[PDB]
Amino acid sequence: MELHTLRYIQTAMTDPGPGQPWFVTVGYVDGELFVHYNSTARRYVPRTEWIAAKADQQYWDGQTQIGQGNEQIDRENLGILQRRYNQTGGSHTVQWMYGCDILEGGPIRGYYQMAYDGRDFTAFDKGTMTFTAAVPEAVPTKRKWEEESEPERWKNYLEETCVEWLRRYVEYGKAELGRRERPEVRVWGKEADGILTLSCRAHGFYPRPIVVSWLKDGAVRGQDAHSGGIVPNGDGTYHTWVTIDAQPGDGDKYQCRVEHASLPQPGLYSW
């Protein structure tokens, strides 16, 4: 089944750090970064080759207008929220995430959520056409938005607009999104204090999902198994590492197994 996602996330900070823009928006198609805006450049730029190639100038112009408008709004939001919370300066952040998921072309979800200082603030519930106030300070926002018919507006963005563009993007980048990049795998060992820690590292795979298991003479022994999760490289591919603690001299006993879309049969690796 063909599953695709479109996701925008937006960050407005009072304290982004030296040299850093205080406002940033980025968009993802199937988890892959493809557009970017920040308050420094003040325009939307492509982050994949396929969006840069298939989109025209009017697309970027119009999107840049959206980005600038969002910046001005969140500039104001930061001020409104700090006063509502009785906070003067220091460090505060607004976060937005919203988007849609399609399966076989049909929408299966649409979300629009906000957080303040790292905590849920509001979430759109599309089913009941209501906004949820997660904290007392969000109650006037809920009341304001539902008063101005924001539910209908976000219902049509999420069910029509978001979905339409997602279907467009997936066709633009069909070859790229469906690409396969095979990991290079290395098993390494380090003994310290009567404990041999065996490491298995998968380098540069795409797509993101992967299963890396430690097999102890054939059986999926995930007891000592510590996974570092899946982490990104700078080049659009991913990385993961999984360790297992063993007894000294028990190294040729363990096998690393890597299951990934680029590998027709699972890879087996050892020290």
Partner: peptide, 8 residues
């Protein structure tokens, strides 16, 4: 295409 968020 992104959306416009709204003032809180």
């Amino acid at each position: 295409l992104p959306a416009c968020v709204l003032e809180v």
